[PDB]
Amino acid sequence: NLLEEESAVLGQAVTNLMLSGDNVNNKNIILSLIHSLETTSDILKADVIRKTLEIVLRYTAD
């Protein structure tokens, strides 16, 4: 499925925010994804986080 892996990454960011008791909003999702992107060395996993970040950025902007 187009966007399947991205979905899972996005869903994890949302649950992670809820677990830390933070607000689920665009800013915090972005910061969480950027944090994930910066802490992954696996370029294949990095690709998935980057696409997820892009989709959130475009949804946020639009």
Ligand X SMILES: CCCCCCCCO[C@@H]1O[C@H](CO)[C@H](O)[C@H](O)[C@H]1O
What does 18 bind: ligand X, a copy of itself, none (CB cut-off 5 to 8 Å by kind)?
Answer: a copy of itself
What does 57 bind: a copy of itself, ligand X, none (CB cut-off 5 to 8 Å by kind)?
Answer: ligand X
Q: Which stretch binds ligand X (CB under 6 A): 4-12, 32-40, 41-49, 54-62?
A: 54-62
Q: Which stretch binds ligand X (CB under 6 A): 1-9, 10-18, 39-47, 51-59?
A: 51-59
SS (H, E, C) the chain: CCCHHHHHHHHHHHHHHHHCCCCCCHHHHHHHHHHHHHCCCCHHHHHHHHHHHHHHHHHHHC
